[PDB]
RNA sequence: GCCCGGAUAGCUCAGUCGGUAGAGCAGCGUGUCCUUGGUUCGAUUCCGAGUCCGGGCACCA
């Protein structure tokens, strides 16, 4: 079950947006990233620094509730090897996020634009973005302009990738940047 | 002649120039103290030369500007008054009203400036009022224009809690550390919660109650209460104290360092006690963070208010648009702002809505003019608006000219407000620096780390579509505070890496600086994925490689730069949205006049809104006169009330006071004082009520004279009220009236306002007054000046600071004042001048001898000079006809104080009652707190006489009590108290029994057969009636004023007086002494007037002697027959003739006085008969 | 000029006073046009009154304008005065030629600062009767407001010794009357009737030595110089000798012609607004304020003792006291002179609202007599009102 | 009558952010600046009025 746990954690992280950190990847006891995880005979993710406090009150499994001791609950770094890549992917994802916002901030203060800035233009709508939504790979569309497009061509897009509404969530920072741009243009 | 009298009155009695100089010097020394005020405020008052006026720029704070204006007004007033003394009416008027203009500036200032200025400026308010009243005598006579109190002798009554209260409170709570902890808490609550008058921090009661409750007391609840005290209450109190000292302008830590030490001791002892019963540092980590966060919030508000330019731009646009109308355009508009086009009105309204507060504060009437002109519909007629006469006067004027004349003042006010905000920001910056220094010093001069601090999360941006102004303001301030945090973090990392580079180009020695630098930016280093680096640094810095952390320096720097850039962008965006919301909110609200609302708040509007006149009238009509009817005997009440239940209100301002008994005259004076007090309060309230919506209120300097006159009348009447209140039977109601006027002590421009008598020879007094008019003394003044210059010229090894120079100069001035009133005998002046010369030689040679020889020589000089001055003072007392031992003691005290100063600055029945209470308390305690009970007993029974006879009885009873250490001693004490009570009651017009039963009840309450006591008191009353029957004061005074020849002398003196108004006419004048020899002072004065040869000094001395004889009686008829001012005006023989005629024309009033004495005896005998009737009735009923 | 001005009816000097822009000029035009509709008349237009380029540009009256009309039993010379606060002096000069005043008070405004100021100043220069005209009554339909204005004006008149409870008040509209609305022409006719009845014909002094205060001087081309004004007393005939007395040294001249509203007069009588031709005098040798007098009957004076009431701040007077050496401006009938003030013994400062017996010495000698009222103005406001108690020198 | 501008030592003048009048000549200046008020903490200075002086308009019994 040790391999199945990481297998399904990997699929859950992959299907979900990388900015949505899974609640199981982080240790439920301390709500922190995997840095010192432990294992159970069936196989669950915890933290040693948290398991030592948990076992004092209840000498059993936090989730399966089976009677378990501290001797068996040994550090399990096999769950770390995935986490790092995930987080670096997250970091790499974030490595775009800030930039995708930073230039936007500058774009929010430019005056007398010849055309709507590209970061403010939806590629699948060719119009100003009303509410921005960000793909798992790092592209931004409009919420309605993506929903109607997906239902028109059957949850497919661009190169026929399996992308749906539930897997792509609103981009809040870009949304506030759009609000700033609209407020500044409305000043005229 | 009158101008000379005014000049002398200014120079000698009021001493206005000296008062102005003293006030200016004290104010300037206090505000440049550098130990009570900060250096930022002090540097504004540095002058190249002390003869130049302070310059008020547009770049100095509002409070610095008002202080400069006040100091300049004081200097110019002193200059004008000194110029008057160097030689008039116009110059004095101008100086007085310049002082009044400064007073009006104080009136329109805030609480901080008012409390800074009040103690110094309160010293010349009575002087200003008396100067104004003297000036008013140069105007045409206006009877009934004032009709106020007659100011008889007011010239005679010419006159750190914040930093100590909190330390005292926390010391008291340190003292509060089964049943023992059940009354101490209540005692502390009563002692402290009752304290007020300094709660400028508008929460203090909540803090004191919370600390009392929490100090009254598993361990989790106690720890939670301790942390709540350390984090929520105490930091809030410290922050409020810091705001107090920032608005005040004091030095950083003036009144927050002692308080901080006190509460640190308090919290440490609390923590120790809690630990003993079953962390506590008061500056652990988060107290510091909360203090710094409040400081940064205040700093950012100050910086935002300083960097705002919208109000100044709006004012500039408004005045530019108003100034764009030339003569033709203004003529077309008919010089009214209401006749301009509607679009122009809209633009002007948009501009004026942004700077209305400044304009209305400076010009409350032009503000109303502008608002009405811009906003009133043109269809409406002026007549339907019901304008007042002066509002119509302001309305008919050139509106453009009136509005444009306010431009410089309004712009200066706006720029000065911006400068005030910037100055407050600098003050807060120094406050944070000093707070950091104190926090560093208080712990160990060492800092500690912890690997558990929450990371630094930059605030998320959210742009609400439409929210009130305060919402965006809060977001802006949060962004600015976060900017400041990041700025400190970047400064810390810069210093950290600079020290790393300069200390080792991780097992080090000076890890404290690295710890203090890293604690500034630990959250930012933790924000990145650097938890391992942080946890490796903390342990290695608190217990112990540094060559690798230098790598992640550029990353941290660029992260800080990016985040501060983002926060700056976001602050600008939210500021723009704030501007939009402010514009929208301005558009929604209509334009409404604000002048009256600001005028209602200045200083006198606040006092007027209290409506103290209504309460005073309520007490005067409902509680005062009913008590007078209840307690006064009907015989004396018939004099005050013709109807029997209400005072004779048709004649309340009594003016005779010489046809009545002393008790009746005192009651009439008390009624007059209450009436004047009520009238003055009501006039002050009417003149400062701004509740007419159809009227304009012009801000001027010429209303302060009326306000000061009213305040002076009120305070003089209150003075007489407390003077009449020191009677045993009248303490209660007088204290009630005092409690009514309680909210008048504390106001800066009123304050106490007042103080809250030798007998020398008549010729000596006249000569002294003549010398005062015409102004060894020059010799001693030159000697003291030589001493002062010798001290100042001391440039030896013993360096003398300028502060010591000022101290010795002030001591020299005090010594000159003390010795200016002495007469020295033959050769005494030689001895004193030789001693002073030896003293100045020693002072010039202070460094030429050892300190022991110097101190011995100066002590010998002090002894010799003090002995010589005692001899001179005794000689002066003998030659001036005074009483021995009075002036000499004061002269010796002055000399001793002066010598102590120079050596320092060069490197009663109340006691009988107290002992009675002490003995009565010690009687049972020695045969079985005390001080407080004795003090309360003494205070409640203050004002008893005890006579000369009962003193021996009290002493004998105390001796018997001491010998015996049952109720006989108690009975004797009670009957002595009762006899004193009867004496006090008969002195007043009180009904028998009242105060006596009151004091008996008090005595028996403090304590924890009657037939003999009642009989003894009855005998006391019978002998009192006999003694009253034996009185002949009226006959004695009649004989003293004129003997048994007044009628005969009048009959044979009228023809001589008629003949006075030819060669042989003087012949009978020679023979008149052979038939009309005087035998009484009044007849002697008549003969002296008949002589008419006042050129000679012999009959001048004779008149002085006669007036000395007649003064004790003339003073009762009129107050002007004193021995100081009446003699001062006797300079020329014509003045002597005028005074003789004036005294002569009062014979009817002496007759009225003697008849009043007879009526006094007539009333007294009736009082005794009523009293003895009451006691015989009580004695017969009790059986 | 051309006509001869036959004397048939009693002649009354009236004028319009009141606050700025309250309708005095419109009232004068309306009176002229209504009396021309109902009687002979002249029917002057508005632009013929305020005709000066300065007045046309500013829109206000600047100098007094003189018109005439005729009721059935009287002949009126009417002085329209400026109402602006800056031209009060001009008003004063006009107010010196009034045997009666129409105090024009706008119903839409009520009495204003210049209403009170004009009442006081007309009292000081000798206006003995006032008839209030509630103007702009077409713009106010309320009746309570009209009564409020009436009582306020009545109390204002009584404040300055005018019989406020007896003063007639006419509720009209000069703009509508000038337009031609008969209902308001009836009100104008009522005002004319009040002028005829309420104001008595004054008892003129046709026997006293000749006296004429000068209000204006003209340079008639080809003829000479002309001095206009109301003859205070006496009769001035062509060919008689006169002297100019006042600011400068007294001059001598002859009268070579008298006119009255551009009509030749054989002789000017007391109380009549006439114009006199003077032989051989330049226009720069005569100013407003001087006096035409019979030779050797008037001696100008510089120092006089007077009883002066100083106005309070609420009456448009000073708000601060003045001291010795105060130099205000003193306004007598057509004269204004700077003077210095000496206070009585023991007095150093005079408060507003005070009554003083002061000695005033003028910088130029002027023709004045005992019991002559005067005003005291300084800094654009009226600061006091006094009467010459006696003439020192 | 309505504007505009000047008045500072015996003479010619500089003094403008409102902080106690100075450069020359004349023989080391109580010259508060033409005078009077106002505003202002404070006036040669800003506002008003008045006295002289000038140069622009006005009207014409
Ligand atoms: N509605 C109305 N308007 C009037 C009336 N009388 C005068 N006016 C208007 O008020 C304005 C005032 O103009 P004038 O009559 O010349 O005022 P004035 O009394 O001469 O005042 P000054 O010119 O300053 O001397 C004029 O433009 C008229 O149009 C009136 O009775 N009713
Ligand atoms: Mg007009």
Numbering used by the authors:
A (entry chain D): 17 to 204
B (entry chain A): 3 to 89, 104 to 175, 189 to 206, 228 to 267, 279 to 339, 382 to 608, 617 to 655, 663 to 874, ...
C (entry chain C): 2 to 394
Sentences from the paper on this structure:
One of these effectors, SidH, 253 kDa in size with no sequence similarity to proteins of known function is toxic when overexpressed in host cells. SidH is regulated by the LP metaeffector LubX which targets SidH for degradation in a temporal manner during LP infection. SidH folds into a large network of helical bundles that does not share a notable similarity to any other protein in the protein data bank (PDB). Interestingly, we found that SidH interacts with bacterial tRNA and EF-Tu as it comes bound to these molecules during the purification.
3D Focused classification in Relion helped us get the map of SidH bound to LubX with an overall nominal resolution of 3.1 Å. SidH does not undergo even minor conformational changes upon binding to LubX. Helical bundle 4 (Hb4) of SidH, which lies on the opposite side relative to the binding site of the EF-Tu/tRNA complex, mediates interaction with LubX. This implies that LubX can bind to and ubiquitinate SidH that is complexed with tRNA and EF-Tu. Consistent with the previous biochemical analysis, the C-terminal Ubox2 domain of LubX lies in proximity to the SidH molecule. The C-terminal helix of LubX and the connecting helix of LubX which joins the two Ubox domains of LubX, primarily mediate interaction with the Hb4 of SidH. Specific interactions between SidH and LubX include Arg115, Arg119 from the connecting helix of LubX and Arg197 from the C-terminal helix of LubX forming polar interactions with SidH residues Asp684, Asp688, Thr691 and Asp694. From the local resolution analysis of the SidH-LubX cryo-EM map, we could deduce that the Ubox1 domain is probably flexible relative to the rest of the molecule.
